[PDB]
Amino acid sequence: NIYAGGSAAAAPPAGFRIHRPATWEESEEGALSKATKYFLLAEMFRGLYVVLEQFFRAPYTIYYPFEKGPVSPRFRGEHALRRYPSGEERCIACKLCEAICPALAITIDAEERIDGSRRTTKYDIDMTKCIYCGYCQESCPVDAIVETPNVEYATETREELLYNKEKLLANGDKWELELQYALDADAPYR
Amino acid sequence: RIRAFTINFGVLRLILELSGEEIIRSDPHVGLLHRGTEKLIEYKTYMQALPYFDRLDYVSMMTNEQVFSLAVEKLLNVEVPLRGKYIRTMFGEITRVLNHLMSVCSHAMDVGALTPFLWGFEEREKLMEFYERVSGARLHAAYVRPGGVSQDLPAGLLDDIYMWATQFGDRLDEIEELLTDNRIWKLRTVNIGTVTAQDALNLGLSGPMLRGSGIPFDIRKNAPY
Amino acid sequence: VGQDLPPVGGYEPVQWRRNLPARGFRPLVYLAALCGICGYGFYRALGGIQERRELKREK
Amino acid sequence: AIIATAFAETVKFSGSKQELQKRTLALYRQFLRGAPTFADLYEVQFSIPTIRTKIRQEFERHRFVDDLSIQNVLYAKGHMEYQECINFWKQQAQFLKYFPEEDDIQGRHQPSNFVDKFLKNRA
Amino acid sequence: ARQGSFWPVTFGLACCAVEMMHVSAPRYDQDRLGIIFRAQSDIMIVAGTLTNKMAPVLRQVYDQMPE
Amino acid sequence: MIINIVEILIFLVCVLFSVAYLTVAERKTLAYMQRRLGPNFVGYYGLLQAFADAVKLLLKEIVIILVISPLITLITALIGWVVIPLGPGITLGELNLGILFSLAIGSLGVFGSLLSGWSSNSKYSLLGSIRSTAQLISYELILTSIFIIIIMFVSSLNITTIIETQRVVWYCIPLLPLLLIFFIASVAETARPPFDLTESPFVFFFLAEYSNIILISAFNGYLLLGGYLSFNYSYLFNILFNDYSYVSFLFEGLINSSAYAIKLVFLMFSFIWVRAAFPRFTYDNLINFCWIILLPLLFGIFLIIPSTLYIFDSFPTL
Amino acid sequence: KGYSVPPGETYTAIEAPKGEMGVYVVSDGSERPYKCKIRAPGFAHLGAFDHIARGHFLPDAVAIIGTMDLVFGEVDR
Amino acid sequence: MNTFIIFIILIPIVGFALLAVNILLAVYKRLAFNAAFILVAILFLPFDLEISTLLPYVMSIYLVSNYGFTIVLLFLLILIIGFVYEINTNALKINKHNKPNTDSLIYK
């Protein structure tokens, strides 16, 4: 038709008028049958039985200091500056990881040597304010900074938590083969 | 004269003025976790403004990511592909499963039922594995970019999402069984927090609370995306 | 190539309805069993009371 | 939120200067009357007359304001500050924002002439 | 006794408070040595962003702890 | 002299141990209800949990009355252990009015809840202590009234007289609804959480809590269920032993205490089992449950029992 | 730099499991957004508290919390 | 010297010892109410105290056969009408103002 105006084809659906709630006398069970559930706590014992079923099965719990939970290859933990095979630092002072960081953790000083190649005098990540987005891994064209999957590195001072170039080159030294394995397994999806 | 005494009832301060047991007026403070995330995103690009949205409302993080990466897409006049649409749909729905798995089993703890909180956590852990295998970190997946979705699924992930979806029906019916019929659960909650259908609107309420009161409205079916 | 896909036949349907198989007996049956076990208990108890009274007579 | 909080008033904007003067007058009376509560409440070191002379000298700061609507916002901000102070919402470290000159003398060499400014290049 | 039982009055105030509750979750229990995060002991744990408003509240909670 | 000081040594040391191993048992079984390991172990080294946290609990801060209420709460919780019998005629002190004593000490147990709210007072905390007190006395009523309707069949205030009367049939199986309402009144005396609004020196309340847990378990075990009684066992002995000897009295005292301890242990497990499954009460619901609905049933059961003893001859003789 | 966005304003709202969560972003035409506000869903849920929680008991002020679902990354933000 | 009395002498010593080890090892350093709260305890006493009027019958139930029965039945039946007084009058129930009184909106 034409609708009234102030009004559309979104009428109330067929059956949205819900029925009157039935009284005591339009009930299917007897009052004695209802009182057996009332006094003998019929559904209390049901929920008691459920938690007793959970008592007799084998728990989900795992030992932390001797087992680590299931992890992905694309997981992210402490940083590392990689190197080339035949020993070369691989960060070409290209300044992309500093320009993308949503918390401004990177600070790089760049200087050029006689050779014409480019490296960094001072590389720096403040880990009080790195937020683990992995954009710094995504931006570097030469794949020089990564996220090693280590998380067990909690420290006791903040000055330990300021990572300079030397600490991150050490982290790229230690984690290398698992790092290369994770990047090679990640590499089709990037 | 009625004399009401005041008490200092995540992080939340809440003033209660009590005349005996009854609350006569209530006044929630808020702001002790205001950290200025609305002003900071004006100084960051959109690619950098994306993690400011799993910072807020952290329990259901992919949906909060999605609302910004939809407002941006509408303002861009671009179009996420088809695989992108199904992929973001199902991650938003396991995000819904996670948020209700926290919210239901935390209302159950605040009321007092202590088993579903523990049971819920184990189920949640399986979902945080589903996030952990897709983005890097658990609990802060930036995985829906504004242009689309950040990278492709793993090789054998869709099979494990099916393997979880088979058992989850039974493990949900189990936690449901001891709360839905329970007299203490039903008694403590049948007449509490009632909201009329006209005042569900004037208060600006939405979602499960506007749908509590009888009004059929949801943005998934009304204005879909 | 290499990305994950669903199988060509599709997966089997999962259970998303409510599974509540009825496992309680009828309430009048439990009440009949309760009245029976009570009445047998009162039989034994009042029989013991009468026997203890006859022993008190003997003492 | 139907009901307001305790000492609040509906923010409403006068069209005349004399009505505003009456309202700021009643407002200074409210601060000055509630000044003995603040020393008990925020556990300050010092005397009630120093609270009262500060409330006075904070209304000395805006004595010669001409524009009506700037007096209006200044009244609304003062009533919000009274509202926070008379309850326990402010704490004792934000109540002492108001007294930075009283609590401690920072040390020697407050510069006065150009030379004392200039030896530490205007500080 | 202080070694074998360790009851941190947790200051979980943002995102990291749920990850702290994932210790209290059935996977990463730490039920065995004896850390229980469910809640006047001698350690607290600050976990999440400490705003301008809360720094007196944080210090006041830190003050009423045993020495 | 030496004959009885060794006896009270053995009993005090056993009850003091068992109350401490309950604090471990509750952590363990609630761990496996929720699929966690919980505490590492439970053995002879297993007390060193409950010992170690019972030590460290004495290292926190507190902020003449504060001295007295933990003390009287713990000694009220500890003196009620004589009057339970552990076997036939085995009591640490034999008294013909043991239920009157047990009842008077369930009456003495309320005072620490009053005097705990006075210490470090606020207005709202004082009101909360009032609410815990009033629920404690409210369920103490129905506790005492069912003690009456149990000793209606005995007509004696001695406890071994109850259990020897109980030899023919336990009182739990005729009066099964009474078992149900006693179990809930028993987790009502204590603050067990279906019934625990008003919770949600501390070492004494902590110890006396579990001591009241296992002691009201004992009060269930002798009057409703069989106290030390399991079966007749007249025939097995005539095949094993030839004559009364200290081995024979050992074996019978052993099986009697086993039959008592199995009642107490299953009931004690059921307390922790009803802890986990249910949320807690509004206080209005608590008082409403005690008075308006359960206690009219209690008057009704009270009227229907002597009339049933009346219809038959069946009055019990002292 | 980043990508650049056409100038304009939008309010895009979706259904978070907490409720309707919208975001209102205003684009300069540059690569930084000029202004962008979230509509946290729990903001109006906690704002609706003392219209709903009047005349209830005090433990009736606790069950009413967990279904207005306050996580407080939302309500302050 | 029987075996009953060392126990109730020896327990206050156990409490004093567990208290003195606490004094050795520790660290140191009106609102209006509702009528239901006062009434639960005030009214608890006449229901605790009929119980002790019921205590002498339960011991001597055999002697007073057929006659002390009816006296106790009448005693309880006089108490039940005061019980039904308090449950007819809704005495323990605590009320609040959460209803909007459900008055229909009247115009002009």
Ligand SMILES: CCCCCCCCCCCCCCCCCC(=O)OC[C@H](COP(=O)(O)OCCN)OC(=O)CCCCCCCCCCCCCCCCC
């Ligand atoms: C023979 C003729 C007569 C036939 C009928 C039989 C009568 C004899 C039986 C008497 C035994 C009565 C048992 C206690 C009665 C409990 C009353 C009840 O459950 O419901 C009333 C009350 C709520 O009151 P209302 O406003 O009416 O609520 C309506 C909701 N349906 O509910 C409540 O407030 C609380 C409900 C839960 C009570 C606390 C639960 C304690 C949990 C313990 C459960 C048992 C655990 C057993 C453990 C060992 C099991 C192996």
Ligand SMILES: CCCCCCCCCCCC(=O)OC[C@H](COP(=O)(O)OCC[N+](C)(C)C)OC(=O)CCCCCCCCCCC
């Ligand atoms: C209200 C009840 C009305 C229904 C009555 C129907 C009962 C059947 C009749 C059998 C009588 C009989 O034969 O049993 C007799 C027994 C005692 O046996 P005795 O020691 O050997 O007697 C000695 C033999 N002389 C006398 C020859 C020497 O007495 C009873 O305890 C039976 C009572 C049945 C339980 C009734 C309780 C009902 C529940 C009430 C709680 C709400």
Ligand code: SF4
């Ligand atoms: S992971 Fe993120 S915050 Fe950290 S350095 Fe990389 S881009 Fe910056």
Ligand code: SF4
């Ligand atoms: S790590 Fe990458 S982005 Fe950073 S300076 Fe090196 S090459 Fe450039």
Ligand code: SF4
């Ligand atoms: S450290 Fe802050 S930003 Fe990071 S997850 Fe924790 S709460 Fe959120």
